[PDB]
Design a protein around this ligand. Structure first.
Ligand SMILES: Cc1cc2nc3c(=O)[nH]c(=O)nc-3n(C[C@H](O)[C@H](O)[C@H](O)COP(=O)(O)OP(=O)(O)OC[C@H]3O[C@@H](n4cnc5c(N)ncnc54)[C@H](O)[C@@H]3O)c2cc1C
Length: 476
């Protein structure tokens, strides 16, 4: 065979059954990522996620150089690039990891249809998720489960997730080395941020370095107030790009449990984090409108306020609430925030305060999060906004109290909002309540150096609970 492995997600060599299928009885294999630099140039996704991708592709190229191959980064779109590749390379086989997302499913059907009309064998494997999403849906009567316990109940009737596949070996990549064009292969070199049209003046080191190598080092390190800060053990961005396999993560947790607890089978709760991901993957896959309200079959139609101004303040960290604003700032700057911080800002935007559609929240998170995941992101926003999944009521977060309770020192705020450095702890979560004297001593006048709160939380959250109540009454 003359094989191409197409990377999209699954940005790794370990647990890559699709790559193994590419190399099996192959004369030649080439690993490609297809990247349209003019699409990248116009994309509204911010630099952090774009940077993470490039760094992941850099690491993949470094891993391939140790197997005496290289990554081929091909400039263009799959549709008008593949036919050129199929001929120029004499391609016999095309492989890739399965994409369960409605758009991805769509694109890939078109790619394999063209591949069949070209005499090219296509092989896919579903290694991005723990389970075969389609099987879960079949077991549920051809609809996805819309509650977590129903999901868990389906999961309990199925075989355990597949174990991580054996990684391609140092010598198996010898029997089908690609022919590297000397120093000309940099026509397939990994693009820089400047190439992708990003300004990079005073950038500085990534807090979250992309790539498989980093993913595996982070997972190994973990298996052994400040929780708001970026840990050297956050795996979400790695899972999202497939730098880390979810299956390896699952069974490595399993092994950890078996060593710590000995004579014990782990509870489903050990794997809850990965299972929540699976749950949203399952709900999303047959729903082309999953990230919308209108025309979304599982979403309650809610008359959210159209308030572009409020949305911009929320997005820009200019609400009047230091906890909210510090979160949005860390998000924009670093591209990762804690789960509880995500809940806090999402609640504020939607049913807790601003009454703005969860859809606008999804879009802001998609632009800023390193781990921005179509399935998980939209699912999370729908769930917490009580828009889907039979939720109806949810966790109540005070845009003052919740920060006070998570970090009483206020040091988190002082880090992300240095203008508020000077306020004592008893005021820093609600500086509008500091006396003028305290404000002056902190060298930050509220309404001048930092905005007044943009809503009265007490009254607005009260108004909203009645609005939500009115929606579910007429609903039934
Ligand atoms: C509004 C909102 C939006 C979100 N958007 C995203 C998103 O775009 N991408 C994303 O990956 N996660 C999203 N999450 C889930 C969660 O907040 C992050 O996955 C988690 O904070 C990452 O932290 P961690 O890596 O330390 O997770 P860990 O505690 O290490 O959990 C391990 C992995 O499990 C997954 N996970 C954990 N919790 C959840 C959950 N509740 N739902 C689904 N998956 C989970 C993540 O992939 C994470 O890497 C969102 C949550 C909310 C409330």
């Amino acid at each position: 065979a003359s094989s191409v492995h197409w990377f999209r997600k699954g940005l790794r060599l370990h647990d890559n059954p699709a790559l193994l299928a590419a190399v099996r009885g192959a004369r030649c294999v080439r690993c490609v990522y297809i990247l349209d630099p003019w699409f990248a140039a116009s994309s509204s996704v911010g630099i952090n996620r774009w940077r993470f991708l490039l760094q992941s592709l850099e690491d993949l190229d470094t891993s391939l150089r140790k197997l005496n191959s290289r990554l081929f980064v091909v400039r263009g779109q799959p549709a008008d690039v593949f036919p050129r590749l199929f001929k120029e390379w004499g391609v016999t086989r095309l492989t890739f990891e399965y994409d369960s997302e409605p758009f991805g499913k769509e694109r890939d059907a078109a790619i394999m249809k063209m591949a069949k009309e070209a005499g090219v064998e296509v092989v896919t494997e579903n290694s991005h998720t723990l389970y075969d999403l389609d099987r879960i849906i079949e077991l549920n009567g051809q609809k996805p489960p819309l509650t977590y316990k129903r999901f868990q109940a389906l999961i309990s009737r199925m075989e355990l997730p597949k174990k991580p596949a054996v990684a391609v070996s140092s010598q198996q990549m010898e029997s089908c080395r690609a022919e590297i064009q000397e120093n000309h292969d940099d026509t397939y070199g990994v693009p820089s941020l400047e190439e992708l049209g990003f300004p990079t003046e005073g950038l500085g080191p990534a807090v979250w370095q992309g790539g498989e190598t980093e993913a595996l080092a982070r997972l190994d390190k973990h298996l052994e107030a400040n929780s708001l800060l970026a840990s050297p053990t956050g795996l979400s961005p790695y899972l999202r790009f497939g730098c880390l396999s979810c299956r390896l993560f699952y069974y490595r947790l399993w092994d950890l449990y078996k060593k710590v607890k000995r004579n014990s089978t782990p509870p489903l709760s050990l794997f809850g984090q990965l299972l929540w991901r699976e749950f949203f993957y399952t709900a999303a896959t047959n729903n082309p409108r999953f990230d919308r309200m209108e025309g979304n079959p599982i979403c309650i139609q809610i008359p959210w306020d159209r308030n572009p101004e409020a949305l911009a303040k929320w997005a820009e960290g200019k609400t009047g609430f230091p906890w909210i604003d510090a979160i949005m700032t860390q998000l924009r700057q670093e591209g990762w925030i804690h789960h509880l911080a995500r809940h806090a800002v999402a609640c504020f935007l939607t049913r807790g305060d601003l009454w703005v559609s969860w859809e606008s929240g999804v879009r802001v998170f998609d632009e800023l999060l390193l781990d921005a995941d179509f399935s998980v992101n939209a699912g999370s926003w729908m769930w917490l906004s009580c828009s889907a999944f039979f939720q109806q009521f949810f966790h109540c977060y005070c845009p003052v109290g919740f920060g006070r309770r998570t970090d009483p020192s206020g040091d988190y705020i002082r880090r992300y909002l240095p203008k508020l450095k000077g306020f004592p702890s008893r005021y820093i979560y609600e500086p509008w309540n500091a006396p003028e004297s305290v404000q002056k001593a902190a060298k930050c006048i509220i309404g001048v150096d930092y905005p007044r709160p943009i809503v009265n939380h007490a009254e607005t959250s009260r108004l909203n609970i009645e609005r939500m109540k009115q929606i579910y009454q007429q609903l039934s």
